[PDB]
Design a protein around this ligand. Structure first.
Ligand code: NA
Ligand code: NA
Ligand code: NA
Length: 135
């Protein structure tokens, strides 16, 4: 089951695409109703002013994402969570854990998100338009 945001999709499909995005990132049925920010963000991705990649990015940086999947955890644990939500897999090696560990110490949640989202792997699997999915 793969979902991709494109500007000319029907509203039914767009709704389905957005819903998948929240479920993959927040692991629950968040809605535009949750905050001004998320609603604004949703309007951006729905209208094509930002791509799906950019939507995932801003979503993963949000206070909701931060309080559920970053703030309560040690660097080590927060990065494996972000891996799963953004990349659809767990970290593959101790060398990869280390790479992202320093990024987290260095630039916290925003740097963790940017790095996962801007990796060549993310580009290969999900690109600009596709919701991350469990691999
Ligand atoms: Na914003
Ligand atoms: Na939020
Ligand atoms: Na940032």
């Amino acid at each position: 089951q793969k979902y991709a945001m494109k500007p000319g999709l029907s509203a039914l499909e767009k709704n389905a695409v957005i819903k998948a995005a929240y479920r993959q990132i927040f692991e629950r049925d968040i809605t535009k109703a949750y905050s001004q920010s998320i609603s604004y963000l949703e309007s951006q991705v729905r209208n094509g002013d930002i791509s799906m990649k950019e939507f995932v990015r801003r979503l993963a940086k949000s206070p909701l994402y931060r309080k559920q999947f970053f703030e309560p955890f040690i660097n080590s644990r927060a990065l494996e969570l972000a891996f799963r939500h953004i990349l659809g897999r767990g970290p593959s090696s101790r060398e990869e854990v280390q790479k992202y560990f320093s990024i987290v110490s260095s630039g916290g949640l925003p740097a963790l998100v940017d790095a996962l989202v801007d990796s060549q792997e993310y580009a290969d699997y999900f690109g600009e338009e596709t919701v991350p999915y469990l691999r």
